[PDB]
């Protein structure tokens, strides 16, 4: 009746996980293990309607987190464990070789190893996740599935994916642009079509995934035709600064100027284990970074009018920041008055903390907040490919 | 009538003109090139026929200037006598030089100290100054520097900062400085005239295309953002994929990325060959499509600087002034913005002719031939009066 999938998303400092029924999206477990390789290493999870938290021990990382999942969390619930039909892994880079999700075998693992040069920070983490998954769940060893953040973007034509350099760069070396957060962009695209009550294959939108890293895509007739992760150029390359190492007063200021003050994606985004792009010395330094970010965000959105062929249906906001940071949406859209955008303050405040909705003034260009669910898409793909 | 010798000295070439600063009249123009090579040569136009001569094997800046003085002007002592000033194109003036300046010892040092930002240009400019001081000793106190970066110094920090730790700016001055600012300046002044409105109220996006162009956002007559140098249509170690990624996402040249992280550079250049480098129709089309796609994206990106109002897009430069299909193909992508090109107007506005190329009733798009040499003559005359 149900097809439960264990979903693993390993990064350089954390591991986000869930158990999800791929048939209807029911969540049986979700959580976040974070502050890896530090004294503060910890794990937060939600199960049977209740939130829980434990220390993983000083210096713990992925192996330890998975151990705690199997021997503490799932040890209480062997019945849950028994239901698992597959494991889905979120993988940053699949290049041109893997343009859709795929069952993991030794050559897929080799493909991931060979892609170390793309988001290198998270590369070891993905592999450790696969290695530990195979060990901890020997019964599912032929039913691990890789789901690639580049895959959705494989529809980009060459005018979009080529660098502004000699064609030989691509012809001889295969150097090329690829795209980030593809599973999220994919998810919000399918959802936008429902919210706008139209066929996905007629959908022209611009999608802004603002989370761990920030990317913007141009969707024409339901397919990605251009994308950039230039909002956070160093994401996946450079550690950045742990939020908890910054003066708490600076961080409170950042969170409040973002528009995240009340009046899973959210737990991650406000975490003192989240890494940020600069070691802000002052409140002013933090605000500057935010203003630069909103300026660049507005430019990306404007730039993708060049992909819309005369029709733009909506701009979509998603991810830890996009779903919750009302001021990022206000300030970025507020720079695009010439395109007929106008943010409705009350609508914008309401579309936070997991609530979806339109944030435009009715009668002006649609702007929409759609909480992403990368874990569900990974579950659906993992279940579909192992059935 | 106030004649100025205008020089733009590069590592392997020297562009020159004599311009009446009062009315824009041109008395001489030319280009010396293939320096440090067997084929070093000079082409010029005067009275008003086109000529060319070899400068001699290995010749460079000193020979080029010697030729101007002793061959081109030897027959025109009255032209030589009417020279009132010399204006020099300087690629990088950093944050210090926000307008044109009479060259003295401190300006020389300014140019030197900031060579790191433009290591292949600023040094050649200095040779040009040194050689001009020799070749035109009567004008020794009347040399003026005009900076390609000056017009761009009105950019606020939200535009000029890269998406990098703030220490890179604070400690090392890593920042957008802009390119072709003398051209963006010029077409901004002219656009206000074509649109019949004050320059202080002008919101436009200016596209200097040609010679590694750039696109700027002008709000209330001032530059508020500008692009990196575009690639012209001829287009133990960190993985190169990361370098290109950083280049593309930051908007920083491959060289400035590596940096922040006897011309060999011209030994196989075009001016060396009689025949041409082959380019297939398919490869030419691909290059065109990539260029026009990226150009349209820049234009759309700068709607985010316009604060609700975009008066016009402006095209200029050797490509922008002349390439009808670049304008049609790039604007063709921006229907959302209300752009639509009229083919016949588009074809009319070429080869030195200005005009509107938009369809009547659509967002204005204008071709304005740039005149950087006039701006340089104007500044040089004004500042030395």
XYZ file of C-alpha atoms in Angstrom:
772
model
C 0.000 0.000 0.000
C 2.883 2.354 0.911
C 6.490 2.529 -0.324
C 8.767 3.880 2.376
C 12.164 5.209 1.357
C 15.094 6.226 3.539
C 16.412 9.554 2.233
C 19.960 10.674 2.932
C 21.451 14.059 2.113
C 25.074 14.293 3.178
C 27.066 17.511 3.217
C 30.426 18.565 4.561
C 29.064 19.629 8.001
C 25.725 17.789 8.274
C 23.388 15.004 7.299
C 19.692 15.615 6.662
C 17.503 12.528 6.599
C 13.932 11.319 6.381
C 11.769 8.292 5.921
C 9.029 9.056 3.429
C 6.223 7.148 1.827
C 6.796 7.694 -1.893
C 3.167 6.850 -2.698
C 1.562 9.742 -0.789
C 4.382 11.762 0.810
C 3.698 10.751 4.443
C 6.724 11.427 6.650
C 7.605 8.870 9.324
C 10.936 10.392 10.336
C 12.861 13.527 9.447
C 15.854 15.177 10.995
C 19.194 16.878 10.835
C 22.616 15.824 12.183
C 24.980 18.872 12.228
C 28.054 20.592 13.657
C 30.126 17.700 12.303
C 33.814 17.341 13.368
C 33.181 19.642 16.326
C 32.538 19.339 20.098
C 28.954 20.491 19.372
C 28.135 17.562 17.005
C 24.436 16.794 17.497
C 21.338 15.284 15.958
C 17.751 16.579 15.971
C 14.823 14.409 14.822
C 11.018 14.301 14.672
C 9.084 11.063 15.011
C 5.639 10.132 16.443
C 4.785 13.847 16.400
C 7.595 14.607 18.858
C 10.869 16.512 18.399
C 14.049 15.138 19.944
C 17.739 16.049 20.215
C 20.916 14.274 21.313
C 24.668 14.936 21.295
C 26.584 12.683 18.920
C 29.860 13.082 20.824
C 32.760 15.463 20.240
C 34.038 15.204 16.640
C 31.241 13.003 15.289
C 30.361 13.104 11.589
C 28.424 10.977 9.076
C 29.342 7.470 10.222
C 28.375 8.389 13.804
C 25.126 10.089 12.704
C 24.044 7.062 10.655
C 25.028 4.828 13.599
C 22.738 6.849 15.865
C 19.932 6.657 13.298
C 20.212 2.836 13.052
C 21.052 1.926 16.675
C 19.100 4.554 18.597
C 16.286 5.966 16.420
C 15.338 2.940 14.331
C 16.229 0.490 17.134
C 13.095 1.748 18.917
C 11.122 1.039 15.748
C 12.198 -2.137 13.915
C 8.755 -2.014 12.223
C 9.684 1.210 10.445
C 13.009 -0.249 9.414
C 11.212 -3.340 8.074
C 9.141 -1.145 5.733
C 12.140 0.459 3.961
C 12.026 -0.346 0.214
C 15.078 1.719 -0.913
C 17.573 4.388 0.055
C 17.796 7.679 -1.855
C 20.934 9.807 -1.786
C 21.085 13.430 -2.762
C 24.167 13.865 -4.957
C 25.395 17.282 -6.085
C 26.987 16.419 -9.378
C 26.113 13.997 -12.133
C 27.438 15.963 -15.128
C 26.372 14.910 -18.620
C 26.908 11.194 -17.855
C 23.925 11.004 -15.416
C 21.010 13.111 -16.648
C 18.411 11.470 -14.410
C 18.317 9.428 -11.200
C 20.022 6.014 -11.245
C 20.409 2.876 -9.092
C 23.813 2.972 -7.398
C 26.426 0.432 -8.500
C 30.239 0.574 -8.597
C 30.384 2.683 -11.767
C 27.903 5.266 -10.376
C 30.164 5.468 -7.286
C 33.105 5.914 -9.671
C 31.171 8.674 -11.446
C 30.707 10.453 -8.105
C 34.433 10.037 -7.258
C 35.317 11.452 -10.693
C 33.075 14.456 -9.991
C 35.054 15.365 -6.853
C 36.107 18.474 -8.710
C 32.478 19.773 -8.514
C 31.291 20.997 -5.074
C 34.478 19.288 -3.713
C 33.501 20.138 -0.105
C 30.520 17.783 -0.213
C 32.188 15.124 -2.331
C 33.712 12.980 0.435
C 30.396 13.366 2.355
C 28.258 11.841 -0.416
C 30.570 8.812 -0.674
C 30.733 8.297 3.092
C 26.918 8.402 3.085
C 26.763 5.707 0.396
C 29.453 3.586 2.116
C 27.754 3.798 5.533
C 24.289 3.164 4.013
C 25.465 -0.042 2.309
C 27.069 -1.266 5.569
C 24.160 -0.326 7.911
C 21.444 -1.640 5.562
C 23.011 -4.675 3.775
C 19.481 -5.813 2.796
C 19.026 -2.673 0.621
C 22.478 -2.808 -1.029
C 21.099 -3.125 -4.600
C 18.390 -0.541 -3.949
C 20.367 2.608 -3.196
C 19.528 5.371 -5.664
C 21.518 8.505 -6.590
C 19.442 11.637 -7.284
C 21.452 14.432 -8.894
C 21.104 18.187 -8.389
C 22.395 18.701 -11.968
C 19.830 16.489 -13.677
C 16.899 18.951 -13.960
C 19.265 21.408 -15.642
C 20.344 18.989 -18.409
C 17.669 20.482 -20.651
C 19.773 23.738 -20.994
C 20.702 24.436 -24.666
C 24.333 25.159 -25.584
C 23.795 28.945 -25.728
C 23.047 28.626 -21.984
C 25.532 25.965 -20.864
C 28.637 27.156 -22.731
C 31.076 29.477 -21.054
C 31.942 32.728 -22.883
C 35.266 31.189 -23.844
C 36.523 29.228 -26.913
C 34.224 26.380 -27.967
C 37.230 24.030 -27.681
C 36.993 24.456 -23.908
C 33.832 22.335 -24.284
C 34.555 20.383 -27.475
C 37.992 19.184 -26.333
C 37.692 19.273 -22.486
C 33.873 19.131 -21.927
C 34.006 22.231 -19.681
C 30.475 23.456 -19.323
C 28.103 24.967 -16.798
C 25.758 22.592 -14.855
C 23.464 24.028 -12.166
C 22.545 23.557 -8.539
C 19.536 22.434 -6.470
C 17.985 20.747 -9.502
C 15.744 18.484 -7.395
C 14.328 21.540 -5.665
C 13.866 23.549 -8.915
C 12.167 20.472 -10.370
C 9.842 20.150 -7.355
C 8.778 23.782 -7.245
C 8.176 23.789 -11.009
C 5.629 20.937 -10.716
C 3.986 22.726 -7.783
C 3.860 26.148 -9.511
C 1.846 24.613 -12.356
C -0.784 23.456 -9.807
C -0.821 26.806 -8.042
C -1.280 28.609 -11.322
C -3.801 26.000 -12.576
C -2.032 25.287 -15.837
C -0.122 22.510 -17.584
C 3.548 22.229 -16.500
C 4.456 22.044 -20.214
C 3.106 25.620 -20.674
C 4.887 27.014 -17.657
C 7.331 29.937 -17.954
C 8.648 30.874 -14.535
C 11.831 31.964 -12.733
C 12.648 29.839 -9.674
C 14.854 31.050 -6.803
C 16.219 28.339 -4.491
C 17.738 30.245 -1.614
C 19.107 27.870 1.039
C 22.468 26.189 1.521
C 23.716 28.036 -1.473
C 21.475 30.118 -3.747
C 20.534 29.388 -7.343
C 18.122 30.879 -9.876
C 16.653 29.117 -12.904
C 14.711 30.068 -15.971
C 11.937 27.589 -16.834
C 10.305 27.808 -20.330
C 7.377 25.499 -21.144
C 8.190 23.476 -18.033
C 11.885 22.832 -18.748
C 15.002 24.505 -17.362
C 16.620 26.581 -20.094
C 19.182 28.495 -17.997
C 20.427 28.522 -14.419
C 23.056 30.036 -12.178
C 24.462 29.386 -8.709
C 26.294 32.739 -8.759
C 24.426 34.093 -5.714
C 26.810 31.978 -3.592
C 29.852 31.388 -5.858
C 31.919 29.746 -3.002
C 29.230 27.300 -1.814
C 30.622 23.767 -1.953
C 34.154 25.210 -2.448
C 35.022 26.982 0.807
C 33.757 26.265 4.389
C 32.772 29.795 5.366
C 32.253 30.739 9.028
C 30.072 28.796 11.500
C 27.118 30.970 12.543
C 27.766 30.082 16.244
C 31.340 31.504 16.031
C 29.902 34.929 15.276
C 28.738 37.373 17.964
C 25.106 36.336 18.707
C 24.045 40.001 18.459
C 25.243 40.105 14.820
C 23.364 36.935 14.005
C 20.148 38.213 15.637
C 20.501 41.296 13.480
C 21.017 39.240 10.334
C 17.940 37.063 11.073
C 15.784 40.063 11.832
C 16.935 42.076 8.769
C 16.184 38.945 6.654
C 12.537 39.135 7.798
C 12.552 35.821 9.643
C 11.159 37.169 12.967
C 7.715 35.702 13.798
C 4.711 38.092 13.958
C 12.982 21.169 8.884
C 14.120 23.717 6.281
C 13.582 26.330 9.007
C 15.515 24.369 11.669
C 18.443 24.124 9.289
C 18.385 27.781 8.251
C 18.389 29.262 11.807
C 20.848 26.654 13.161
C 23.962 27.941 14.934
C 25.734 25.145 12.985
C 24.908 26.783 9.634
C 27.969 28.150 7.826
C 27.797 31.645 6.383
C 29.758 33.276 3.564
C 31.823 35.774 5.560
C 33.010 36.307 9.133
C 30.918 39.426 9.770
C 32.757 41.699 12.241
C 29.735 43.974 12.808
C 25.963 44.300 12.235
C 26.744 46.711 9.365
C 28.964 44.068 7.699
C 26.111 41.544 7.928
C 23.559 43.966 6.501
C 25.922 44.844 3.653
C 26.180 41.171 2.724
C 22.411 40.910 2.739
C 22.042 44.005 0.553
C 24.609 42.703 -1.926
C 22.769 39.350 -1.992
C 19.360 40.992 -2.646
C 20.850 43.180 -5.385
C 22.367 40.160 -7.118
C 19.193 38.157 -6.616
C 17.198 40.905 -8.303
C 19.695 40.942 -11.210
C 19.370 37.178 -11.763
C 15.625 37.412 -11.898
C 15.754 40.358 -14.316
C 18.349 38.576 -16.466
C 16.062 35.601 -17.007
C 13.401 37.719 -18.718
C 15.795 37.058 -21.668
C 14.631 33.392 -21.559
C 10.896 33.950 -21.269
C 10.198 34.650 -24.990
C 7.709 37.423 -24.123
C 5.805 35.574 -21.355
C 6.583 35.351 -17.640
C 3.955 33.483 -15.526
C 5.520 33.844 -12.078
C 8.628 34.111 -9.924
C 8.994 31.354 -7.366
C 10.786 31.562 -4.028
C 11.922 28.401 -2.160
C 14.573 26.903 0.185
C 15.496 27.714 3.797
C 15.920 31.430 3.002
C 13.402 31.759 0.154
C 10.533 30.194 2.196
C 11.142 32.210 5.349
C 13.056 35.429 4.693
C 10.278 37.841 3.792
C 12.690 40.803 3.527
C 14.836 39.032 0.909
C 11.719 38.651 -1.218
C 10.610 42.265 -0.597
C 13.977 43.883 -1.270
C 14.739 41.810 -4.392
C 11.303 42.244 -5.971
C 11.293 45.923 -4.885
C 14.244 46.486 -7.245
C 12.136 45.167 -10.166
C 9.266 47.689 -10.259
C 9.994 48.259 -13.961
C 8.875 44.634 -14.619
C 5.509 45.189 -12.829
C 6.377 43.472 -9.579
C 4.901 44.733 -6.340
C 5.087 42.797 -3.088
C 1.991 42.800 -0.847
C 3.298 43.184 2.705
C 0.613 41.070 4.438
C 0.740 38.288 1.861
C 4.556 38.284 2.154
C 4.511 37.971 5.967
C 1.988 35.150 5.815
C 3.994 33.078 3.337
C 6.575 32.026 5.922
C 7.557 29.047 8.115
C 6.120 26.362 5.832
C 3.113 28.215 4.436
C 2.913 28.495 0.650
C 1.241 31.427 -1.118
C 1.205 34.342 -3.529
C 3.086 37.375 -2.253
C 2.358 39.818 -5.090
C -0.350 42.422 -4.951
C -3.246 40.838 -6.797
C -3.296 42.233 -10.355
C 0.555 42.662 -10.521
C 3.059 39.924 -11.676
C 2.637 36.676 -9.738
C 5.345 35.969 -7.120
C 4.914 32.777 -5.108
C 6.473 31.030 -2.109
C 6.517 27.260 -2.448
C 8.251 25.294 0.349
C 10.464 22.775 -1.381
C 10.479 19.032 -0.621
C 13.647 17.596 -2.090
C 13.269 14.519 0.145
C 9.932 13.586 -1.429
C 11.318 13.769 -4.985
C 14.321 11.668 -3.938
C 11.916 9.123 -2.338
C 9.725 9.006 -5.495
C 12.757 8.516 -7.706
C 14.337 5.903 -5.383
C 11.064 3.949 -5.225
C 10.325 4.278 -8.966
C 13.774 3.064 -10.038
C 13.963 0.070 -7.708
C 10.420 -1.183 -8.402
C 39.865 75.687 -32.971
C 41.783 73.848 -30.197
C 43.725 70.854 -31.537
C 44.527 67.870 -29.307
C 46.682 64.838 -30.025
C 44.737 61.858 -28.623
C 46.688 58.685 -27.857
C 45.645 55.237 -26.791
C 48.755 53.156 -26.262
C 48.497 49.379 -25.814
C 51.234 46.739 -25.405
C 51.359 46.013 -29.142
C 49.706 49.041 -30.758
C 49.109 52.806 -30.583
C 45.876 54.451 -31.734
C 46.162 58.154 -32.453
C 44.120 61.131 -33.614
C 44.253 64.883 -33.868
C 40.897 66.340 -32.917
C 39.569 69.885 -32.701
C 38.240 70.036 -29.137
C 35.822 72.876 -30.040
C 33.842 71.231 -32.859
C 35.049 67.592 -33.115
C 36.836 68.060 -36.454
C 39.347 65.285 -37.182
C 42.652 66.269 -38.792
C 44.405 62.888 -38.476
C 43.516 59.351 -37.370
C 45.451 56.121 -37.466
C 46.681 53.002 -35.827
C 50.191 51.633 -35.444
C 50.297 47.935 -34.686
C 52.208 44.640 -34.748
C 54.805 46.133 -32.441
C 57.911 44.051 -31.554
C 57.186 42.012 -34.663
C 58.674 41.883 -38.139
C 55.448 43.307 -39.574
C 55.234 46.475 -37.370
C 53.272 49.051 -39.406
C 51.228 52.265 -39.293
C 48.031 53.226 -41.095
C 46.645 56.730 -41.129
C 44.010 58.932 -42.704
C 44.603 62.585 -43.473
C 43.389 65.029 -46.209
C 41.303 62.749 -46.316
C 43.105 59.820 -47.956
C 44.171 56.532 -46.328
C 47.832 55.551 -46.199
C 50.126 52.935 -44.686
C 53.811 52.277 -44.159
C 56.061 49.766 -42.450
C 57.533 50.966 -39.172
C 60.418 48.462 -39.511
C 61.070 45.027 -37.943
C 60.617 45.032 -34.138
C 59.363 48.657 -34.150
C 57.160 49.899 -31.306
C 55.883 53.041 -29.552
C 58.943 55.300 -29.993
C 59.139 54.513 -33.736
C 55.391 55.010 -34.133
C 55.570 58.486 -32.509
C 58.761 59.320 -34.472
C 56.897 58.420 -37.650
C 53.940 60.652 -36.705
C 56.297 63.576 -36.104
C 58.799 63.119 -38.953
C 56.749 61.608 -41.752
C 53.066 62.334 -41.168
C 53.383 65.846 -39.717
C 56.603 66.882 -41.550
C 54.400 67.899 -44.448
C 52.027 69.758 -42.090
C 53.982 72.096 -39.779
C 50.785 74.166 -39.257
C 49.098 71.079 -37.724
C 52.062 70.528 -35.485
C 51.994 74.196 -34.366
C 48.240 74.104 -33.597
C 48.611 71.141 -31.203
C 47.585 72.517 -27.780
C 47.585 69.355 -25.622
C 47.928 65.572 -25.574
C 45.259 63.294 -24.099
C 46.068 59.703 -23.054
C 43.607 56.846 -22.598
C 44.292 55.120 -19.273
C 42.508 51.802 -18.675
C 42.649 51.882 -14.882
C 42.469 54.835 -12.493
C 41.331 52.826 -9.426
C 39.345 54.654 -6.757
C 41.662 57.638 -6.783
C 41.028 59.069 -10.248
C 37.369 59.875 -10.590
C 37.919 62.382 -13.380
C 40.484 63.403 -16.007
C 43.745 65.012 -14.765
C 46.823 66.877 -16.013
C 49.680 64.403 -15.882
C 52.451 65.194 -13.408
C 54.854 63.007 -11.454
C 52.158 61.936 -8.933
C 49.797 60.828 -11.741
C 52.627 58.781 -13.270
C 53.020 57.111 -9.837
C 49.261 56.635 -9.536
C 49.264 54.784 -12.856
C 52.273 52.674 -11.825
C 50.900 51.699 -8.368
C 47.635 50.507 -9.949
C 49.212 48.484 -12.771
C 48.299 45.300 -10.830
C 44.668 45.926 -11.761
C 45.484 46.294 -15.471
C 48.950 44.746 -15.878
C 48.792 44.549 -19.699
C 47.577 48.148 -20.206
C 48.764 50.586 -17.555
C 52.506 49.888 -18.386
C 51.993 50.619 -22.094
C 50.227 53.876 -21.233
C 53.387 54.915 -19.317
C 55.590 54.221 -22.381
C 53.157 56.362 -24.395
C 53.485 59.215 -21.928
C 57.298 58.920 -21.793
C 57.491 58.884 -25.603
C 55.009 61.763 -26.055
C 57.073 63.890 -23.640
C 60.082 63.324 -25.942
C 58.289 63.669 -29.288
C 56.274 66.765 -28.340
C 58.494 68.569 -25.878
C 56.514 71.839 -26.339
C 53.474 70.044 -24.812
C 55.369 68.514 -21.849
C 53.210 70.295 -19.251
C 49.984 69.781 -21.199
C 49.543 65.975 -21.106
C 46.247 64.744 -19.651
C 45.134 61.327 -18.399
C 41.503 60.240 -19.139
C 40.537 57.049 -17.276
C 38.223 54.260 -18.579
C 37.235 53.639 -14.925
C 36.344 57.196 -13.860
C 32.715 57.229 -15.070
C 32.104 54.053 -13.113
C 33.215 55.497 -9.726
C 29.650 56.580 -8.897
C 28.746 52.870 -8.373
C 27.535 52.180 -4.850
C 29.144 49.398 -2.795
C 26.157 47.046 -3.323
C 27.159 47.053 -7.041
C 30.943 47.310 -6.916
C 31.553 44.492 -4.404
C 32.028 40.957 -5.602
C 30.219 38.147 -3.770
C 33.412 37.441 -1.757
C 34.598 38.140 1.786
C 34.617 41.883 2.405
C 38.310 41.722 3.420
C 39.236 41.329 -0.281
C 37.919 44.852 -0.870
C 39.029 46.294 2.439
C 42.598 44.942 2.311
C 43.273 44.535 -1.417
C 40.855 46.863 -3.270
C 39.199 43.968 -5.127
C 36.125 45.648 -6.587
C 34.437 46.198 -9.976
C 36.124 49.179 -11.583
C 34.449 49.031 -15.020
C 35.659 49.417 -18.621
C 35.078 51.807 -21.539
C 33.812 54.445 -19.102
C 34.681 57.273 -21.539
C 32.355 55.695 -24.097
C 29.544 55.002 -21.574
C 29.966 58.619 -20.440
C 29.734 59.913 -24.021
C 26.645 57.969 -25.130
C 24.946 58.879 -21.818
C 25.319 62.583 -22.661
C 24.122 61.982 -26.235
C 21.182 59.768 -25.178
C 19.777 62.654 -23.062
C 19.796 64.774 -26.232
C 18.125 62.069 -28.326
C 15.472 61.471 -25.701
C 15.001 65.250 -25.234
C 15.493 65.206 -21.451
C 17.984 66.194 -18.749
C 20.899 63.816 -18.269
C 20.194 63.965 -14.504
C 16.849 62.233 -15.159
C 18.176 59.578 -17.551
C 17.686 55.886 -16.759
C 19.289 53.794 -19.501
C 21.301 50.654 -20.096
C 24.331 51.292 -22.266
C 26.031 48.579 -24.289
C 29.517 49.294 -25.552
C 30.097 46.377 -27.840
C 33.476 45.837 -29.553
C 37.053 45.575 -28.234
C 35.918 43.529 -25.238
C 32.898 45.673 -24.434
C 30.786 46.173 -21.350
C 27.202 46.951 -20.364
C 26.334 49.585 -17.731
C 23.238 50.641 -15.822
C 22.749 54.407 -15.737
C 20.262 55.817 -13.245
C 19.653 59.574 -13.123
C 22.612 60.049 -15.459
C 25.103 58.182 -13.263
C 26.588 54.736 -13.619
C 25.214 52.510 -10.828
C 26.397 49.087 -12.045
C 28.595 47.713 -14.832
C 29.548 44.373 -16.295
C 32.836 42.608 -16.740
C 34.641 42.879 -20.124
C 32.738 40.834 -22.635
C 34.437 38.302 -24.835
C 34.380 39.658 -28.412
C 32.637 37.532 -31.088
C 35.976 35.756 -31.616
C 35.022 33.300 -28.856
C 48.737 20.406 -7.032
C 46.601 22.710 -9.190
C 42.992 23.837 -8.610
C 40.809 22.139 -11.247
C 40.268 24.501 -14.206
C 36.499 23.851 -13.926
C 36.522 25.730 -10.600
C 38.437 28.652 -12.145
C 35.909 28.997 -14.991
C 33.027 28.605 -12.490
C 34.418 31.408 -10.382
C 35.020 33.565 -13.438
C 31.455 33.093 -14.702
C 29.658 33.459 -11.339
C 31.742 36.344 -9.902
C 31.968 38.345 -13.107
C 35.754 38.525 -12.873
C 38.292 37.789 -15.642
C 40.070 34.425 -15.504
C 43.279 36.423 -14.873
C 41.959 38.493 -11.971
C 40.737 35.224 -10.431
C 44.175 33.588 -10.586
C 45.619 36.873 -9.334
C 43.321 37.201 -6.283
C 43.483 33.483 -5.479
C 59.009 41.365 -25.877
C 55.360 40.666 -26.708
C 54.874 36.907 -26.597
C 51.149 37.536 -26.095
C 50.962 38.881 -29.667
C 53.384 36.488 -31.413
C 50.508 34.872 -33.429
C 48.126 37.887 -33.817
C 45.988 38.699 -36.920
C 48.087 41.619 -38.019
C 50.924 39.204 -38.653
C 49.076 37.299 -41.425
C 47.922 38.019 -44.996
C 45.349 35.176 -45.013
C 42.564 34.806 -42.418
C 41.813 32.409 -39.558
C 39.061 30.001 -40.711
C 35.630 30.098 -39.028
C 32.845 27.762 -40.190
C 29.231 28.940 -40.550
C 28.110 26.587 -37.736
C 30.808 27.792 -35.343
C 30.080 31.432 -36.256
C 26.361 30.922 -35.567
C 27.079 29.245 -32.225
C 29.387 32.076 -31.199
C 26.764 34.610 -32.206
C 24.012 32.842 -30.288
C 26.129 32.622 -27.097
C 27.133 36.298 -27.384
C 23.581 37.561 -27.970
C 22.158 35.363 -25.264
C 24.654 36.694 -22.726
C 24.092 40.252 -23.968
C 20.316 40.015 -23.562
C 20.854 38.633 -20.042
C 22.983 41.613 -19.093
C 20.322 43.998 -20.386
C 17.585 42.146 -18.403
C 19.809 42.031 -15.296
C 20.103 45.796 -15.157
C 16.338 46.324 -14.917
C 17.216 45.739 -11.188
C 19.025 49.129 -11.134
C 16.308 51.138 -12.851
C 14.074 51.929 -9.777
C 10.887 51.412 -11.838
C 11.782 53.257 -15.054
C 13.889 52.285 -18.127
C 14.063 55.063 -20.730
C 16.080 53.227 -23.364
C 18.744 50.700 -24.229
C 21.770 52.200 -26.017
C 24.083 50.367 -28.423
C 27.586 51.634 -29.264
C 31.147 50.548 -30.069
C 32.594 48.877 -33.164
C 30.076 46.044 -32.941
C 27.176 47.911 -31.261
C 27.161 50.676 -33.866
C 27.347 48.378 -36.877
C 26.053 44.860 -36.202
C 22.294 44.875 -36.936
C 21.853 41.182 -36.128
C 23.500 41.452 -32.710
C 20.922 44.124 -31.817
C 17.993 42.228 -33.340
C 18.934 38.895 -31.801
C 19.651 40.213 -28.301
C 16.559 42.548 -28.137
C 14.479 39.753 -29.711
C 14.944 37.860 -26.463
C 13.569 40.742 -24.348
C 9.872 40.951 -25.390
C 8.981 40.784 -21.684
C 10.701 44.125 -21.349
C 8.701 45.527 -24.255
C 11.559 45.515 -26.763
C 10.939 44.915 -30.469
C 13.377 45.924 -33.204
C 12.252 47.460 -36.496
C 14.379 45.880 -39.259
C 14.466 48.958 -41.494
C 15.388 51.392 -38.713
C 17.914 48.824 -37.486
C 19.623 48.712 -40.902
C 19.583 52.510 -41.208
C 21.450 53.047 -37.888
C 24.826 51.658 -38.966
C 28.311 52.731 -40.064
C 28.351 56.026 -38.163
C 24.639 56.861 -38.363
C 22.638 57.253 -35.139
C 18.958 56.522 -34.629
C 16.097 54.692 -32.960
C 15.834 51.039 -33.872
C 12.749 50.148 -31.809
C 9.364 49.663 -33.415
C 7.190 52.760 -32.908
C 5.269 52.413 -29.603
C 7.775 49.951 -28.046
C 10.530 50.577 -25.506
C 13.154 52.949 -27.020
C 16.323 51.360 -28.362
C 18.964 53.691 -29.813
C 22.286 53.401 -31.712
C 24.717 56.182 -30.776
C 28.206 56.075 -32.416
C 30.664 56.723 -29.635
C 33.414 59.325 -29.779
C 35.933 58.589 -27.044
C 38.587 60.665 -28.865
C 36.390 63.782 -28.649
C 35.857 63.315 -24.896
C 39.593 62.941 -24.426
C 40.223 66.087 -26.599
C 37.582 67.980 -24.599
C 39.085 67.055 -21.225
C 42.674 67.732 -22.380
C 41.816 71.152 -23.813
C 39.654 72.142 -20.791
C 42.134 71.042 -18.151
C 45.113 72.704 -19.873
C 43.410 76.038 -20.689
